[PDB]
Amino acid sequence: AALLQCTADTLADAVLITTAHAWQHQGKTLFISRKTYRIDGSGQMAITVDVEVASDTPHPARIGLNCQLAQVAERVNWLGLGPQENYPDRLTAACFDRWDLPLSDMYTPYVFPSENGLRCGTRELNYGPHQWRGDFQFNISRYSQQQLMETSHRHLLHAEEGTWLNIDGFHMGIGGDDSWSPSVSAEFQLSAGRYHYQLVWCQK
Amino acid sequence: ALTEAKHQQQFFQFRLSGQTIEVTSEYLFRHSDNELLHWMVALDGKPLASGEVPLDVAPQGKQLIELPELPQPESAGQLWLTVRVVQPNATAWSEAGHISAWQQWRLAENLSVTLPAASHAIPHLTTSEMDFCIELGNKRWQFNRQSGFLSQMWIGDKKQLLTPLRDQFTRAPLDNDIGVSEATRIDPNAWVERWKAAGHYQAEAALLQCTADTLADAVLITTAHAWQHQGKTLFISRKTYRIDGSGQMAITVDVEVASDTPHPARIGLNCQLAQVAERVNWLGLGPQENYPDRLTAACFDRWDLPLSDMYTPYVFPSENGLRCGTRELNYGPHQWRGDFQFNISRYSQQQLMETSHRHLLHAEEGTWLNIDGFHMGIGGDDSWSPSVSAEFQLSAGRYHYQLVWCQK
Numbered sequence: 348a349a350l351l352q353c354t355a356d357t358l359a360d361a362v363l364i365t366t367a368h369a370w371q372h373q374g375k376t377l378f379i380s381r382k383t384y385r386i387d388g389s390g391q392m393a394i395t396v397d398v399e400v401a402s403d404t405p406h407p408a409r410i411g412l413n414c415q416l417a418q419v420a421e422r423v424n425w426l427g428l429g430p431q432e433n434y435p436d437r438l439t440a441a442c443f444d445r446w447d448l449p450l451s452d453m454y455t456p457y458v459f460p461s462e463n464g465l466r467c468g469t470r471e472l473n474y475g476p477h478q479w480r481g482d483f484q485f486n487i488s489r490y491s492q493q494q495l496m497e498t499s500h501r502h503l504l505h506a507e508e509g510t511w512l513n514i515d516g517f518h519m520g521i522g523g524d525d526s527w528s529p530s531v532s533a534e535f536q537l538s539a540g541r542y543h544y545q546l547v548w549c550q551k
Numbered sequence: 552a553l554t555e556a557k558h559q560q561q562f563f564q565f566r567l568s569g570q571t572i573e574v575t576s577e578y579l580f581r582h583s584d585n586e587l588l589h590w591m592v593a594l595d596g597k598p599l600a601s602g603e604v605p606l607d608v609a610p611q612g613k614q615l616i617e618l619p620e621l622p623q624p625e626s627a628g629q630l631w632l633t634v635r636v637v638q639p640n641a642t643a644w645s646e647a648g649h650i651s652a653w654q655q656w657r658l659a660e661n662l663s664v665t666l667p668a669a670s671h672a673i674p675h676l677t678t679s680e681m682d683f684c685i686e687l688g689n690k691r692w693q694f695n696r697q698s699g700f701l702s703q704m705w706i707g708d709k710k711q712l713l714t715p716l717r718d719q720f721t722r723a724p725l726d727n728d729i730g731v732s733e734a735t736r737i738d739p740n741a742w743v744e745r746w747k748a749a750g751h752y753q754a755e756a757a758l759l760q761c762t763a764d765t766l767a768d769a770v771l772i773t774t775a776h777a778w779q780h781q782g783k784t785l786f787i788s789r790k791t792y793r794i795d796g797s798g799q800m801a802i803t804v805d806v807e808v809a810s811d812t813p814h815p816a817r818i819g820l821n822c823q824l825a826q827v828a829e830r831v832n833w834l835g836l837g838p839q840e841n842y843p844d845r846l847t848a849a850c851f852d853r854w855d856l857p858l859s860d861m862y863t864p865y866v867f868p869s870e871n872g873l874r875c876g877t878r879e880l881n882y883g884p885h886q887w888r889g890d891f892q893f894n895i896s897r898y899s900q901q902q903l904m905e906t907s908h909r910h911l912l913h914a915e916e917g918t919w920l921n922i923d924g925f926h927m928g929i930g931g932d933d934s935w936s937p938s939v940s941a942e943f944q945l946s947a948g949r950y951h952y953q954l955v956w957c958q959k
Binding site: 349351352354356358359360363369376378379397399401402403482534541543545 | 657
């Protein structure tokens, strides 16, 4: 990530900070991300994310915000498709309702570690004191994305300190018809080039 | 629509694989004896490479054609590979130089990490009870506080708009939208009747919030409107106009649509420009009109056409002359950037649907411009029933588009 622009201003009602990043590989820019965090007088932070993706590059698996929360709550309450994990390619079975599950249920123990426990169409996510609003996809877990791909078995996985949260506004379809060849459908892939999502981060 | 049929019925197919192009002949009996393949490579409509290849394809056969190594433009933008099949020699049914088949690809996009900000000057606003006023050098922007829409723009020693810039959720009903529905016979299934019952055409804008602030670099005004019919809100539109120190106005529009309501024909900004220029220059799919449902024939390039060409004279007046995938639109001094769909015309959307014939149409004062970030597919398989495909309809519920409005 290369910080090309970072500014901070105060509106009359709230404080607004505008930033813009760029991801570059061997001199070529892959993604350009522009964000405008707004800190309401109530404490609610509205993050507006506008992401541009190059056409030459293969489409990204997800367009997302991710962070590691130091707090580890026993329960996860969210309003969206559930209760089990679901993806854009596979969410017809999932039902929209207010769901409440333990943190362990939010993680699918596939023998071969990978991306798991994603809930789509979530309007509200309550984890501990934190709360996230807007329509997004999340897969809160104790294991980071970097740890899963490096790990070969599920028993080797160690619960990382705090909790890893991946709030992605857009996610690629998982597929698929077969394993040996790319089977993700065209419409499920993230090939728009430009993407936008806004989530309101607040406490309690 | 005839250029769409021509492109879909062309007797040469194309499958690009990196540098090499593959031409498959759909001819059953004749060999490509009089064919000439020409390919152009351009960024931002600017040709960087061109070449001619003698097309010598067998019937139902496929030919692999390698292109010379192409230049890599350091200037940011999107490269386009356009190939076309030209007939060098004349024929009994066609002139020499006739184009029979064409195809365009998208390759080697270069994102711009350049920083527009910031100019030495700084815009200035003056807040009053009546409205909002923003001044920068020769230019002055005014935002009406009663309605929430900007009422007037200024240059010089000069004037701009004839009608305030507002959100647009409807279009002039096409023959497909109308269907077999008449005044004597109401048809529930027709799109035009669903839109009438929902009250899209008669939806009034309600200014729920309007604020104005000044950032260090630029002036930012945030507004939010709502369209309500019989006590029910149909759309909620939130906008954050940003007036750069250079004079460039970046309009960020976020629109929410109810699920109960039938999906809007377009999500759009529209206004009436007092200026009437003879030519229209735009960068996008063209040169002829094209829609999300019908744009495969359209080719992306820098197009320049008279204002009359931008209007399609259908005998029965309706929505027409729309150009999709437009990155830049130059009309007179005005300029609009970002990816959008536009159909600049002399006739308003309200005039077209009320009019029954094309000869009754009178050119309204100034020029009507409809810049829509999203537009519904026109269809269709048949006229008498709704034939717009699901993916082409505007059914996401939430929509977002941002365009940069500047002068010169």
